[PDB]
Amino acid sequence: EPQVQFKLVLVGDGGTGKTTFVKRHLTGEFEKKYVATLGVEVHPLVFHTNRGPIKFNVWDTAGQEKFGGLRDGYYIQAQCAIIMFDVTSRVTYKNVPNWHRDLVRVCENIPIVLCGNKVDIKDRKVKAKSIVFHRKKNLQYYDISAKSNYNFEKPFLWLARKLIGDPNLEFVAMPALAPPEVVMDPALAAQYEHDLEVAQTTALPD
Amino acid sequence: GPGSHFEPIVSLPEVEVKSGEEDEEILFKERAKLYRWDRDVSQWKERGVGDIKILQNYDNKQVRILMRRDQVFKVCANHVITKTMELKPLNVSNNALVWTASDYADGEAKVEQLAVRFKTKEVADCFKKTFEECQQNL
Numbered sequence: 001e002p003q004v005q006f007k008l009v010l011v012g013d014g015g016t017g018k019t020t021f022v023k024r025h026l027t028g029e030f031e032k033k034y035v036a037t038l039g040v041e042v043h044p045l046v047f048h049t050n051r052g053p054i055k056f057n058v059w060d061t062a063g064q065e066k067f068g069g070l071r072d073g074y075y076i077q078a079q080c081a082i083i084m085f086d087v088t089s090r091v092t093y094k095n096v097p098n099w100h101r102d103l104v105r106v107c108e109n110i111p112i113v114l115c116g117n118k119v120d121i122k123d124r125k126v127k128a129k130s131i132v133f134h135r136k137k138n139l140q141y142y143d144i145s146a147k148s149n150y151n152f153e154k155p156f157l158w159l160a161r162k163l164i165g166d167p168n169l170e171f172v173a174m175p176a177l178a179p180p181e182v183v184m185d186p187a188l189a190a191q192y193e194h195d196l197e198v199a200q201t202t203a204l205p206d
Numbered sequence: 207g208p209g210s211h212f213e214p215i216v217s218l219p220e221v222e223v224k225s226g227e228e229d230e231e232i233l234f235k236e237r238a239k240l241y242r243w244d245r246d247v248s249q250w251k252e253r254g255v256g257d258i259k260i261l262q263n264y265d266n267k268q269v270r271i272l273m274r275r276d277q278v279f280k281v282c283a284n285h286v287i288t289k290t291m292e293l294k295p296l297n298v299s300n301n302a303l304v305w306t307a308s309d310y311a312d313g314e315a316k317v318e319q320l321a322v323r324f325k326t327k328e329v330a331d332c333f334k335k336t337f338e339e340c341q342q343n344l
């Protein structure tokens with residue numbers, strides 16, 4: 001029962017991991033294939049806190065120019081944003097100001113998190129020292145990795161604390177309702193059986 | 207910029223959130239990586255990483271599996287253990303077990319093929335033992 005909804009616009013260069021970051025929160029998966037986002041894809045993310053469930057409607061925008069779609073048209077009535085770049089690609093960090101400029105042009109003083117993704121990669125190109133844009137604009141910065149989940153919840157915890165005005169806000173265990181005993185559909189029984197056989201021949205991702 | 211300025215803030219009241227586990231006994235609690243089979247692309251997809259629990263209700267003796275993700279604490283597995291479930295090794299991976307369940311992690315029942323991977327073979331063997339001990343006591 002979400003107490004509040006917030007529109008969150010996720011922006012950044014193509015390939016920086018925006019869609020992978022959102023899918024990780026949505027389903028827990030790590031999608032390895034890069035399929036460019038076409039325009040935007042909107043996904044809800046609910047987090048339970050000591051002050052109730054909080055829903056973020058995440059507008060995952062396209063980073064590729066050719067697939068931009070509405071571009072800044074997606075930002076209308078946005079209450080917060082995440083700017084993502086890749087710490088293994090200096091050009092993605094070089095364009096962070098342009099993304100920030102486009103955001104503030106439409107939304108002005110909304111809370112914004114700057115995220116340097118793919119810190120799991122050894123050959124890091126954008127060193128922690130070279131990241132100074134958050135200081136020049138008063139943004140919150142986090143190193144993150146959607147592959148290793150390093151700090152992958154910090155951007156939402158911080159945005160939540162800023163939007164709710166509660167410095168002590170914490171994520172808490174969502175209620176785990178005891179499930180009912182369901183009898184499985186005998187009609188789809190043969191389908192469940194085939195899926196299990198194929199699954200037993202396929203190995204886990206890592 | 208620096209200095210005074212107005213921001214829209216939504217104030218919320220404190221709430222006592224119950225985990226739903228208060229009336230259950232922990233029979234098993236170990237770290238694990240859970241996977242879910244996606245039949246549309248024929249892949250095992252990571253489903254969550256955290257502590258997977260075998261819980262038993264004190265009063266009605268019902269046994270279920272429950273797991274929560276790290277850092278976000280969201281449910282990635284929630285289903286009762288039945289006598290018809292078959293917990294088998296995943297031969298093509300190491301220290302992995304597979305079984306089918308009607309899961310409620312996302313708020314509604316979905317039949318899913320799940321795979322759980324533990325740190326050691328020893329922990330995996332202890333999970334399979336506790337799992338099958340609950341089945342025999344059904």
Ligand SMILES: Nc1nc2c(ncn2[C@@H]2O[C@H](COP(=O)(O)OP(=O)(O)NP(=O)(O)O)[C@@H](O)[C@H]2O)c(=O)[nH]1
Binds near residue numbers: 012013021
């Ligand atoms: N090593 C590593 N790879 C990552 C990480 N996050 C994402 N990737 C990979 O980076 C690639 C780009 O992913 P994707 O999320 O589609 O990028 P995007 O920013 O959404 N791109 P677009 O703007 O075109 O939609 C994928 O191959 C994905 O697996 C990470 O933390 N580490």
Ligand SMILES: [Mg+2]
Binds near residue numbers: 036
């Ligand atoms: Mg994308």
